[PDB]
Amino acid sequence: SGFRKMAFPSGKVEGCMVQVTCGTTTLNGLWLDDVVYCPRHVICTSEDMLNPNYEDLLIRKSNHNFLVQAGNVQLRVIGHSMQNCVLKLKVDTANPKTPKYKFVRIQPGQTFSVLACYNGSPSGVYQCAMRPNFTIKGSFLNGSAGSVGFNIDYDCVSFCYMHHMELPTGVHAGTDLEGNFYGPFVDRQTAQAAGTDTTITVNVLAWLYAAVINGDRWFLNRFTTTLNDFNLVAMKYNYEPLTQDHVDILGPLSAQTGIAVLDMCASLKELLQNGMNGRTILGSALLEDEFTPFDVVRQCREPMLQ
Amino acid sequence: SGFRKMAFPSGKVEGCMVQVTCGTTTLNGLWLDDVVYCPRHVICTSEDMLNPNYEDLLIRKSNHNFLVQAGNVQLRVIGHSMQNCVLKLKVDTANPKTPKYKFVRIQPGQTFSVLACYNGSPSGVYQCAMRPNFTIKGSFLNGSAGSVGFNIDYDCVSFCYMHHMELPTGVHAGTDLEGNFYGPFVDRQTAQAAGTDTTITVNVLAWLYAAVINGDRWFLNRFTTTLNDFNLVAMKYNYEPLTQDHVDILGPLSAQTGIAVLDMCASLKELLQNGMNGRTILGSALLEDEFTPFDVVRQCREPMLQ
Ligand code: NA
């Protein structure tokens, strides 16, 4: 038993991380087969990062202006192109450690593992949720751009995030691997207007189920409510709407614990209306919303099947 | 910026995990050079996990009785021995992915990364701290024994923990890689209370420095305290004593922020006596104690040196 924020094992992704240097600017790249993907602002000086004309900046670069290092080994860039906010650097050797992979665009409320990297070298791994306002609350310093976020599903690494920037509020923003930002952000030094964030209701419910499975039951009440009435409550506390699809997704956790989803919703309603009584749930003194139903079943599942 | 619980990249350890099966008992082993290290209870049936004379049960076992699998590849066992609570299986093939490594014994309050594994296959990675009662608050299911804890320094993996068991209280206990348990625990189905879990004071102070560096400042005050006057308060709340060695370890964080260690002690003293009053620190409504000063330095340092 136990419940901990857990990342996927990072080795398959570590074997893909490289350093990309243009001039005096260094960040990370993702080396898959014969292409290195990286944030386009590697072609900027620090001053260029204020109001870059990326098309013009890229035209002045040639292949040999891109210094790509895979460990101690320099990879030769033989082509370059820009796709949205990422560069694709074709190199003359393919990465023999390329995992089976795909590029996906994740949805707000979903989680992924971040492999934080500096100078092409993996430094740390942690789990992030894509916030409803399309930021992530991560830990990133200068030089971390090009670090990626991913999930691992059977025989496949699904890359969903490439890190680009830190908003002046201290939260983080980036793109999918097609180079399109999550949220209304741009890779330049201008006002970045993140939406007011909200709490991921389906995830809070999943985490309450995790707590029950681990013996933390004090917050259960015998009340139940309707989906519409719960959502009227959720709205008041800046919680996202709970849909029938969410209720369905919580089905396995509901079945395992014997607690109907709308029963647990009534327990969550009482926690929102009356507080947590100075008590903790799974070691937290706040309601936690960065665990998906799948994250919870990964650690807490007890199959009826024997 | 930002501050997140972060694990070390797990790839170097992933390449060392194997499955060890004896009869119908399976768990994980750590394959370094031509030795596989695993918990000795793999030689026991689930029922035999009570009053097991491991020396007796081991003598009944031969090399062929140990099925060691590195993925789908079987490793021929050519010798077997017991060191305290670990089995060492000599295999006929050195692990070609063996990293530079050390076995170390960690102290309470220190952190490490756990690569949770089942059937020799890594499932997740998270950061944990050795509690003052020598337990770990982890996330471990049956079949996770033999999962290891570690830290990485440059290229060297320091293995400090091998998982064995879950106490009936739901916390976790294990050994170093020489098989010596951390704490007064035995790998037997017998009563074994852990000591009182206390709060790692020096780590709480480190985390408050992290908070200040990330702009959380509301808990700073004009109170002063001596070290002993602080310990007289914190001992009443089951906080570990703060020694002058801890004060010295916090020096670099004190210097970066300009907040004397004892002035941050005066802040912590107030938080203990009176709570947060509905406020949070780094997204938590409780005082976090599983980040070491080094953990804080890794993510928040702002070196004077340029
Ligand atoms: Na209820």
Residue numbers in the entry:
A (entry chain A), B (entry chain B): 1 to 306
Publication excerpt:
The main protease of SARS-CoV-2 (Mpro, also referred to as 3-chymotrypsin-like protease or 3CLpro) is responsible for the majority of nsp processing, cleaving at 11 conserved sites along the polyprotein including self-excision of Mpro by autolytic cleavage of its own N-terminal and C-terminal autoprocessing sites. SARS-CoV-2 Mpro is a functional homodimer of two symmetrically disposed protomers that are each 306 residues in length (33.8 kDa). The active site of Mpro features a Cys145-His41 catalytic dyad, which orchestrates nucleophilic attack at the carbonyl carbon of the invariant P1 glutamine and the formation of an acyl enzyme intermediate central to efficient peptide cleavage. Using C-terminally substituted Mpro chimeras, we have determined X-ray crystallographic structures of Mpro in complex with 10 of its 11 viral cleavage sites, bound at full occupancy intermolecularly in trans, within the active site of either the native enzyme and/or a catalytic mutant (C145A).
C6 (form 2), C10, C14, and C13WT have also crystallized in space group P21 but with a distinct unit cell, two molecules in the ASU, and a unique conformation of the donor substrate (we term here form 2 - see also below). Interestingly, the others diverge from this canonical binding, we term here form 2: in C6 (form 2), C10, and C14 (crystallized isomorphously in space group P21 with two molecules in the ASU) the substrate sequence is kinked ~ 90° at the P3 residues and tracks instead between the dynamic Met49 and Gln189 regions. This altered substrate trajectory appears to be coincident with the close contact of the donor C-terminal domain in this crystal packing. P4 residues in all substrates except C5, which interacts with Gln189 Oε1 form a hydrogen bond between main chain NH and Thr190 O. In the non-classical (form 2) poses we observe here, the P3 side chains (Thr (C7, C13), Met (C10) or Arg (C14)) instead extend toward the S4 pocket due to rotation of the P3 main chain, perhaps another reason for the restricted sequence diversity at P3. In the form 2 peptides, P5 and P6 are redirected between Met49 and Gln189, possibly due to the dramatic shift of the Gln189 side chain, reminiscent of motions observed in the C5 structure to accommodate the unique P2 phenylalanine.
